[PDB]
Amino acid sequence: MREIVHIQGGQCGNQIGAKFWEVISDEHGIDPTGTYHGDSDLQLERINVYYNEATGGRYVPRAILMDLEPGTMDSVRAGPFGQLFRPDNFVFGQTGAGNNWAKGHYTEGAELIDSVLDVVRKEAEGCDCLQGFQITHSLGGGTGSGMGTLLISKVREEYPDRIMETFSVVPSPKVSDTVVEPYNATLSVHQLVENADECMVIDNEALYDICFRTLKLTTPTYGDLNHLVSAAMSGVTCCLRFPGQLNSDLRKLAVNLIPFPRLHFFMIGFAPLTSRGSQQYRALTVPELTQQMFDAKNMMCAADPRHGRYLTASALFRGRMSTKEVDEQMLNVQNKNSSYFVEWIPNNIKSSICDIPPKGLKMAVTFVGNSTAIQEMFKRVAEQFTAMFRRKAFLHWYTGEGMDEMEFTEAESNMNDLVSEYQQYQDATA
Amino acid sequence: MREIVHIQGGQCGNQIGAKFWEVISDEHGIDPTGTYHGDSDLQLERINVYYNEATGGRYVPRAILMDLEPGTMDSVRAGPFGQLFRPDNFVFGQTGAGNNWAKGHYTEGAELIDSVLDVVRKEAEGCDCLQGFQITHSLGGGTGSGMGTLLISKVREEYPDRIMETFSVVPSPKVSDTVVEPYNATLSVHQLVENADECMVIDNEALYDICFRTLKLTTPTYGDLNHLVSAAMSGVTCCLRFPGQLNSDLRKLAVNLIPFPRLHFFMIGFAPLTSRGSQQYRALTVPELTQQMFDAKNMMCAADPRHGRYLTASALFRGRMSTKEVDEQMLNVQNKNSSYFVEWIPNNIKSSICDIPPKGLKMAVTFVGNSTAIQEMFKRVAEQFTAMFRRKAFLHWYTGEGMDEMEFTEAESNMNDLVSEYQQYQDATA
Amino acid sequence: MREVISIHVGQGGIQVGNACWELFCLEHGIQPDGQMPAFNTFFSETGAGKHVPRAVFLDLEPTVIDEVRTGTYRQLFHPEQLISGKEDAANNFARGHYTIGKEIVDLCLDRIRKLADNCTGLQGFLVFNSVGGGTGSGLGSLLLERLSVDYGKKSKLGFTIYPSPQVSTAVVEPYNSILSTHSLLEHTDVAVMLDNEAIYDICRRNLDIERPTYTNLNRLIAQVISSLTASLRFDGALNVDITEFQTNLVPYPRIHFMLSSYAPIISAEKAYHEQLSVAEITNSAFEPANMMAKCDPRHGKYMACSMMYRGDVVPKDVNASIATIKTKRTIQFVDWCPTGFKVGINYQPPTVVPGGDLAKVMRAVCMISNSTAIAEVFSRLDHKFDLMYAKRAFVHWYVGEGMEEGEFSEAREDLAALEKDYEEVGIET
Amino acid sequence: MREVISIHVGQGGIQVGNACWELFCLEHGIQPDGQMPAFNTFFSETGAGKHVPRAVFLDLEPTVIDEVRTGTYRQLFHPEQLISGKEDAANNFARGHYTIGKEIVDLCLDRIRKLADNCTGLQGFLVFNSVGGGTGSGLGSLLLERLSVDYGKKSKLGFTIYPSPQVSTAVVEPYNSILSTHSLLEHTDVAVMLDNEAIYDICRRNLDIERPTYTNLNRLIAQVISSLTASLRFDGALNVDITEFQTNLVPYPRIHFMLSSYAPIISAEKAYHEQLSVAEITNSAFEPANMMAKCDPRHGKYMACSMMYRGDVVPKDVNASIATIKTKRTIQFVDWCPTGFKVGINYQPPTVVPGGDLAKVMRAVCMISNSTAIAEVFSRLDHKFDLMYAKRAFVHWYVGEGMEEGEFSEAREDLAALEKDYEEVGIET
Ligand SMILES: Nc1nc2c(ncn2[C@@H]2O[C@H](COP(=O)(O)OP(=O)(O)OP(=O)(O)O)[C@@H](O)[C@H]2O)c(=O)[nH]1
Ligand SMILES: Nc1nc2c(ncn2[C@@H]2O[C@H](COP(=O)(O)OP(=O)(O)OP(=O)(O)O)[C@@H](O)[C@H]2O)c(=O)[nH]1
Ligand SMILES: Nc1nc2c(ncn2[C@@H]2O[C@H](COP(=O)(O)OP(=O)(O)O)[C@@H](O)[C@H]2O)c(=O)[nH]1
Ligand SMILES: Nc1nc2c(ncn2[C@@H]2O[C@H](COP(=O)(O)OP(=O)(O)O)[C@@H](O)[C@H]2O)c(=O)[nH]1
């Protein structure tokens, strides 16, 4: 029950999706060929939330892939855990959006959205209870942002009752790959504010800092950061996938978090992450889990929360622990960091305790914080955009494909309204 | 009981007929030499519907072949499954109609229709209960269209009580072989509207699209599309040939479908068709069968039904399934696509469930839809005809053999009346 | 029970005939000795032992036909079907159509009747003739008239080696071309313009043979004719009869002048360095350069295209490629023909004649197109005619044989009426 | 389903082409015989056996193209795509752009069409040409105009071997440079300034080859082009399409002149005595000395940097090193571009051509930078132009071919407007 379709776009989204799928398979105990190889029965009673029973006793994931270039196709196929995805869901183009948003949202992606919608309708008509969608795509890539936001508008004008979540990986401000990034970033943040319910930003700067100071790695490979985001993605709903002393879902998140129909941009955090050399010393208990979770540089967003506050903070625990200890630590941490939690909402922290830890751990902690700190991130991306726009830098590449500057003007206006909203709520007190 | 004589004409009709006969033989378990090699008994209790007990314990098909050139004779003989057809039924000419309708309907075919009628009378006098005829012929070929429609007029002035079905393969509008096609097409559509009960159009464009996107083939060979149409032809009446929880026939079709004595042009659809690389993943159940059946590009007619509606839609299932699931899915698909089904006829969808799937499948679905979409096809062929006629292009080849232009004028009038009828029924609502 | 009759009249006709019979005997493997170690279209079996071709070889200059009587094929043909006159035609139509032909038409018709009575499914004749020559014009017209009055319904196809636009090899050849048309305008259903300039250009660009000689020319022509007849001879997915041609490609019974094209014609060293996809081969088919006749089909609008493939052919993908070529915005059809292309397939891959320059390739498109560009040829040709008849040049060498003088003008007017059609039918409606 | 088309026109263009195809055939191991013991970007398979490259070799002097027809690669290319004229261009743009090119543009476009119809995912052309020469200028401009009017949306990239500032090898080369710009200013999306002075300096300092010859030069250029195309050809963490280039690096559609750089280019004996950390290699990347074109990028401000790494690459640490280079207070960007660097990664390590002086090293950064320094070149170059056109030196050798006289001034004014942009866009806001 409560099925969930996975959608991927752009090469970044596709790498993250392949990583997430191999992690989920290795949790539910599904070999790369598509059969069960675990021991318990929990991992099979809730198989239908993600996978489908494939004709012949196989299992295939209910995920769809898209990209305007066909390199990612053979990449994910040759890669580990590729035999699962069914050969139908691979819808792909040849031209390639080529890092130009208007391409992947008005010109070419506009040619494939019909087919992608047909296949999504064939995968959503065959479910009985559809708890919602979740997406994964980079907000800088033309294919990623364009295809994604167009698909989002389509499905959210299609299925208004269900939710729409996006594991979006925003451009890391400092460590920046491409120089036409702010245009795509702002043209996607104007769309995601319309037709989305949970948008958790992830920036490569925080991931590099984590893989570079906490795990004490040496050569941070893109596969590794992808794996970290995959772990967070699993932990998000693994409280739903398995029984728990205090169960949860996606909509209890959607209600216990966003106090205003648009203030829906979350920060993620995983715990516990520690190096191998120090692995044998520290303990796996909820005290250290708490001290490691709330750290500023434990998260996946380059926004030191000490430059803001939290409107709300959910914590999905996994494993088996005495809930009273968890709740006492929550009460103590709130009454210890009373400033960081905004006052006009009382007991703004939420918990949810599941029963099965991941593969290889005793406890695990996902920390989802809707804060008023990432307004700073949006602010600085707006700075980039303005300094790139008022000289019309690289503007003709967008103007050519039909989009008019009015879109950019109104979208920057909407972004400024979003950040003004965040600040206007951090300000008001009672 | 309820015997059926097979008639073929033209080289296209002959290839399709050879393919259909080899598929039927390989279903009933009849080796190419004419003996039984199955295991069950169902395949032999109903042998008389198609075949005849041949002197010596052999089996010979009750099919007749015709063509104005003798190449197809040795083609079908040397081809696989040729030893079955009896050496009497091969009636053939030498001159060849040569892609000129007046030739194969007034000049030469008019010389052989006597003999073809004699042999058809010798094969229809020897049956006890004759459920009707079915034909297979191309509507572009001179031999095909001419011989066919003349034979049809003859037999339908002979046997008015029985039915007359034609697996006619209309000219694919875009992908077009010959340039004198519209003349033959219209001169045959004027005759089939008079003396026929079920005329299912098939166009090579839809078949190429299917063998080119669904089955993911590489080099679509004419044998392959012929095989696809053969599968559809079998599935049409295989609900009659074998027992079933909800049996059917040809006349229950003839009554549950055509609401007006001429609105008798059907679209066919087969399910399930899937590539070999994706064969191992998806499931063989009625949900996916339904989602695959009603698709616009799953059919054999280049008419996207979303440009029209259905007056009526029969579905002959094959295999073994819980009928309640089938009926619930029918109810759900009608109340989901309420627009596509015309309102002034209630519960316009019909089912019929047999008990034995084909060779190599668990379930199978034939979908026969009398829609108001193919009026578009007739419209565009009329466009071709008019632009070819009002300049009298290639007209003298027809004028020479005795036919007068009055035939063409009145036939185009009749075609326009047919399409006006279709539209006038799609319009009226209550 | 499905056969033809191949009349080779004239010099160029009989040379192309020698080459074409080489090809036919080779692809059926019928040894030049006349014994074979499907052929009822051409060779008939003599009850036991050997075969004899269905072809009469009319000619009046015993030179070339004598060389054939002593060539490699001295034992193949029947010792009678090779008719040799006494003198020449000498390029003046009046001779080969009034004085000499009056004597040989009887023998030719007797031979033709004795061949046609020994067949059961005759479909169409296939004459071959040049026009610049005397005999290939006069005798060709005479036979066409006699067969048309004698047989009636049957369809006749010609293969006329018209005068090239610029490169020429005779002087009075405009005259005895025009007259040859004023007959061939009626008693024949399809006239394919096989020119000599375009073929030499082709052998200079594609096959890279630098110094092309008449042998290679006739080889290519034989290739086209065999690719046409493959439908009757060999098996095929989509057979086409030689009689559905009068139905498809002859819209108005007067305008039946079609130009051919062949692909792929490649030499080995570039053949290996090339894949020759069906899209590519049919894209080279419509290319104006390699049109077998000297014209730029861009200049007008097409009216019909009979495209026959032979070899491995993936049908629906051929349909796709044909659609793409219909998107090619430089080839446009007249208004009154939306049913653009007629196609045909055959399984027999091209058969290569040993020693020939052409390389053995798997697929091959032969395209017979009826267009409006071909018209200009007639126009241009009349030009030449004009510049002679206005001064009565060479006319007396015609009036000497009793041919009425004024007929020229008459014929000219008739051919002028051709344009009354062509530049007319290309008008939208 | 992702391919390009490489047009090599002119002398230097075709020499760099010979070297570059050497490299491409080597790293895919495609033997020079043309048989292999991923390549659909360049070589297409001919159904069976061998491969043929996607490259037309336009030239009019049969010397170098003839040497190629007899070189080590005589069996690789298609025997047709190597077009050879009859005479020379002789450095005067009017010749190779008005008289001669008027005849060869047709054949080149026919070839280009026959290649592009045999592909399914074409992305961008890659022309190569010198400017000082006649053919590499005239014919290059002509093809660019014809392809732009024929194809439209597709992106064209050029590799122009501009005149060096001080070291020169022709005299009228300023003239037929300016004109070549006034065309290349429009029909091409990215023009990379590959100079000859900077490359010889480089081979004199880095690789320590004391007497550099054109072979080593072309080798280095081939290296850069392969490092660019590695994104399409081979796998990679962060693929970049050849089409996102027109999006990243061309801010104002008129200012699209970018200069390249490559690292590390070391000989073995100092290669072992060096670690080449990613920080070090990318710090040598921005160094003004080894800029492939002759400029001092310090002199202005950068506008964009496409940095593609190949080999073992630790991403987040590359990010750290890029940050450090952003701290390097001598390389500063204009105000209106804060999103400084765009990056890309590929796993395929540099492939060394056997015998070449370059050593096989694991990582390699190729950096294409659009700056404002490049402007001065044009300025300096116009200087030369001035000092000739004021006295009408050599102008008559241009007006002889029917090219209008005054066009020069017109073109000059156009190029002057370039500075109306450059020294302007570098102004803060
Ligand atoms: N394509 C082709 N044309 C040929 C060939 N041989 C001759 N011709 C052409 O024939 C034309 C001359 O007319 P001919 O038919 O040869 O003259 P003729 O047959 O000798 O008529 P008479 O000499 O008067 O009996 C010229 O245009 C020749 O190019 C050949 O082998 N192939
Ligand atoms: N980088 C590089 N430059 C070359 C090479 N070969 C020639 N050049 C340069 O080409 C420029 C001269 O212009 P060219 O294109 O060679 O003259 P062209 O092609 O012969 O034009 P025409 O002779 O009139 O047909 C000079 O600056 C050469 O240095 C080479 O192999 N590598
Ligand atoms: N965390 C992470 N980010 C990636 C990875 N690969 C690409 N990205 C980012 O994806 C962004 C470019 O978007 P991209 O998908 O390549 O362009 P598109 O084809 O138009 O969707 C860049 O910011 C890349 O850095 C990866 O493996 N891990
Ligand atoms: N789907 C399919 N259509 C065919 C096949 N063969 C021929 N056709 C069509 O048959 C049509 C020509 O009719 P034809 O039978 O050849 O002429 P006839 O001899 O006068 O009957 C053309 O549209 C052919 O494309 C085949 O194998 N499969």
CB of B282 within 8 Å of any CB in chain A?
Answer: yes
Q: Which residues of C touch D (CB under 8 A)?
A: 208, 269-270, 272-277, 279-280, 283-284, 287, 289
DSSP assignments along B309-358, one per residue: -EEEEEEEEES---HHHHHHHHHHHHHHSTTTB-TTSTT-EEEEE-S---
A52 — contact with chain B (CB < 8 Å)?
yes
D33 and D71 share a domain? Answer: yes
Taking the C-alpha atoms of residue D246 and residue A29, their distance in angstroms, rounded to an integer, is: 46
Q: Do C248 and B222 touch (CB under 8 A)?
A: no
Can you say which residues of B are annotated as belonging to the binding site for Mg(2+)? Answer: 69
Which of D30, D45, D80 is the mutation pick for testing C, counting most C CBs within 10 A? Answer: D80
Residue D415 lies in a domain: no
Q: Do B397 and C322 touch (CB under 8 A)?
A: no
Q: What CATH number does residue D349 fall under?
A: 3.30.1330.20
Q: For the residues of D336-396, what is the DSSP string, one character each?
A: T--S-EEEEEESSPPPPPTT-SS---S-EEEEEEEESTTHHHHHHHHHHHHHHHTTTTT-H
* Domain shared by A287 and A138, yes or no: no
Q: Is C103 designated active site?
A: no
How far apart (Å, rounded) are the C-alpha atoms in residues A164 and A147?
A: 15
Contact A9, A137 (CB under 8 A): yes
The shortest CB-CB distance from D235 to any of A75, A182, A383 is to: A75
CB B84 within 8 A of CB B60: yes
B244 and B118, same structural domain? yes
Nearest chain C Cα to B78, which residue?
C235
Q: Are residues C109 and C83 in the same domain?
A: yes
Within a domain: C243: yes
The token pair at A380 is 């600085």
Indicate whether D397 belongs to any domain: no
Cα-to-chain-centroid distance, residue D65: 20
Same domain, D109 and D191: yes
Q: Is residue B13 part of a domain?
A: yes
**In whole angstroms, what is the distance from residue A213 CA to residue A222 CA?**
16
CB-nearest partner of A221 from D244, D304, D315? D315
Domain extent, residue C340, equals: 258-376
Are C40 and C23 part of one and the same domain?
Answer: yes
- Phi, psi dihedrals of residue A317, rounded to the nearest 5°: -90, 155
Task: State if residue B170 touches ligand 4 by the CB under 6 angstroms criterion.
Answer: no
* Domain boundary residue, one of A200, A232, A256: A256
Residue A324 is inside which H or E element, if any?
Answer: helix A323-336
Residue B92 domain-assigned (yes or no): yes
**One domain, residues C253 and C267:** no
- Would A185 be classed as within a structural domain? yes
CATH number at residue B119: 3.40.50.1440
SS3 D283: helix
Task: From D223, D257, D291, give the residue that closes a domain.
Answer: D257
Same-domain pairing of B12 and B117: yes
**One domain, residues B209 and B282:** no
Residue A79: domain span:
3-256
Q: Which residues of D touch A140 (CB under 8 A)?
A: none
Name the closest-CA residue to atom 7, ligand 2.
Answer: D12
Question: In the structure, do chain B and chain A come into contact, i.e. share 3 or more CB pairs under 8 Å?
Answer: yes
Contact A383 D304 (CB under 8 A): no
For ligand 3, whether the C-beta of A144 sits within 6 Å is: yes
- Ligand 3 contact, A177 CB (< 6 A): yes
Shared-domain flag, residues D30 and D174: yes
Packing angle, helices D315-327 and D278-285, rounded to 10: 40
The domain total for chain C is 2
Residues of B in contact with A86 (CB under 8 A): 278, 281-282
CATH of the domain at D243: 3.40.50.1440
Radius of gyration for chain C, computed over Cα atoms and rounded to the nearest angstrom: 21
Q: What is the distance in angstroms between the Cα of A384 and the nearest Cα belonging to chain D?
A: 6
Domain boundary among C257, C275, C310: C257
Q: Which of D186, D244, D280, D407 is catalytic?
A: D244
Q: Which chains touch B (3 or more CB pairs under 8 A)?
A: A, C
Residue in the block written with tokens 């998107």: C327
In angstroms, the Cα distances linking B157 to B106, B132, D389 are 18, 13, 95
Final residue of a structural domain among B215, B238, B256: B256
Is C415 part of a structural domain of the chain?
A: no
Resolution reading in Å: 4.3
Q: Which chain B residue has its CA at the smallest distance from A55's CA?
A: B283
Residues C280, D77: C-beta atoms closer than 8 Å: no
Answer with the one of B359, B374, B389 that is the final residue of a domain. B374
Using an 8 Å CB-CB cutoff, list chain C residues near D45. Answer: 275
B23 and B157 within one domain: yes
- D109 CB near ligand 3 (under 6 Å): no
Last residue of a domain, one of C217, C237, C257: C257
Residues A248 and A285 in one domain: no
Query: Is-contact C251 C303, C-beta < 8 A?
Result: yes
- Is residue C130, in this structure, part of any structural domain at all? yes
**Interval between CA C181 and ligand 1 midpoint (Å):** 16
Q: Where are the alpha helices (DSSP H) in D28-172?
A: 62-70, 93-94, 101-116, 135-150
Atom of ligand 4 nearest to the CA of B104: 20
B176 lies in the same domain as B239: yes
Query: Does one domain contain both D80 and D210?
Result: yes
Instruction: State how far the Cα of C382 lies from the Cα of C360, in Å rounded to an integer.
Output: 41
- All residues of chain A having their beta carbon less than 8 Å from the beta carbon of residue B319 are none
**Residues D232 and D324 placed together within one structural domain of the fold:** no
Chain D residues whose CB is inside 8 A of the A388 CB are 336-339
Distance CA D302, CA D319 (A): 19
Is the beta carbon of A204 within 6 A of some atom in ligand 3?
yes
SS (H, E, C) chain C: CCEEEEEEECHHHHHHHHHHHHHHHHHCCCCCCCCCCCHHHCEEECCCCCEEECEEEEECCHHHHHHHHHCCCCCCCCCCCEEECCCCCCCCHHHHHHHCHHHHHHHHHHHHHHHHCCCCCEEEEEEEEECCCCHHHHHHHHHHHHHHHHCCCCEEEEEEECCCCCCCCCCCCCHHHHHHHHHHCCCCCEEEECCCHHHHHHHHHCCCCCCCCHHHHHHHHHHHHHHHHHHHHCCCCECCCCCCHHHHCCCCCCCCEEEEEEECCCCHHHHCCCCCCHHHHHHHHCCCCCECCCCCHHHCCEEEEEEEEECCCCHHHHHHHHHHHHHCCCCCECCCCCCCEEEEEECCCCCCCCCCCCCCCCCEEEEEEEECCCHHHHHHHHHHHHHHHCCCCCCHHHHCCCCCCCHHHHHHHHHHHHHHHHHHHCCCC
- D3: which strand partners? D122
Q: How far is CA B338 from CA A288, B288, B333, B343, D76, in A?
A: 59, 20, 8, 8, 63
B 198-217 residues with CB below 8 A of A? Answer: 216
Counting beta carbons within 10 angstroms of the beta carbon of residue B144, is it exposed (0 to 12), middle (13 to 18) or buried (19 or more)? buried
3-state secondary structure of D288: coil
Regarding whether A280 and A236 lie in a shared domain, the answer is no
Torsion of CA A349, A351, A357, A361, to 10 degrees: 30
CA distance C43 to chain B (A): 18
Does residue A43 contact residue A36 with C-beta atoms inside 8 Å?
Answer: yes
Return the residue whose CA atom lies nearest to atom 13 of ligand 2: D133
Domain-located, residue B413: no
DSSP letters for A360-414: T-SEEEEEEEEESSTHHHHHHHHHHHHHHHTTTTT-HHHHHTT--HHHHHHHHHH
Q: Please indicate, yes or no, if residue C398 is contained in any of the structural domains.
A: no
CATH number of the domain that A291 lies in? 3.30.1330.20
**Who lines ligand 1 at CB under 6 A?**
C 10-12, 15-16, 60-61, 88-91, 130, 132-136, 161, 169-170, 196, 214, 217-218
Shared domain check, D107 and D156? yes
Same domain flag for B52 and B194:
yes
Tell whether C247 and C201 lie within a shared domain: yes
Domain membership of residue B110 (yes or no) is yes
In a domain, D388, yes or no: no
Rounded distance from Cα D315 to ligand 3 centre (Å)? 12
Whether residue A399 lies inside any domain: the answer is no
Q: Do B283 and A53 touch (CB under 8 A)?
A: yes
Q: Are residues A48 and A15 in the same domain?
A: yes
Question: Binding-site residues of C for Mg(2+), please?
Answer: 61
Q: Are residues D138 and D178 in the same domain?
A: yes
D57 lies in the same domain as D203: yes
Q: Do A222 and D315 touch (CB under 8 A)?
A: yes
**Does C have 3 or more CB contacts under 8 Å with A?**
no
Instruction: Kindly state whether A128 is in contact with chain B, defined as any CB-CB distance less than 8 angstroms.
Output: no
CA distance D155 to D150: 12
> Looking at beta carbons, which residues of chain B come within 8 Å of C123?
95-96
Question: Whole-angstrom Cα distance, residue D126 to residue A229?
Answer: 39
Interchain CB distance below 8 Å, A87 and B283: no
Nearest-CA distance D95 → chain C (Å): 26
- The answer to whether the Cβ–Cβ distance between C340 and B180 falls below 8 Å is no
In a domain, B222, yes or no: yes
Chain B residue with the nearest C-alpha to that of A121: B291
* Ligand 1 pocket, mutate which of C7, C11, C162 (most atoms under 8 A from CB): C11
- B318 shares its domain with B229: no
> A310 with A236, same domain?
no
Q: B10 CB under 6 A from ligand 4?
A: yes
Chain B: give the shortest CA distance to residue C321, in Å. 10
Pocket test for ligand 3, best of A12, A14, A397 (most atoms within 8 A of CB): A12
Q: How far is C287 from chain D (nearest CA, A)?
A: 10
Smallest CA separation from ligand 2 atom 12, residue: D133
- What whole-number distance in Å separates Cα of residue C297 and Cα of residue C426? 13
How many residues are given for chain A?
430
Q: Is D390 exposed, middle or buried (0-12, 13-18, 19+ CB in 10 A)?
A: exposed
Structural domain total, chain A = 2
Q: Is A169 near ligand 3, meaning CB less than 6 Å away?
A: yes
Query: Does residue B422 lie within any of the structural domains?
Result: no
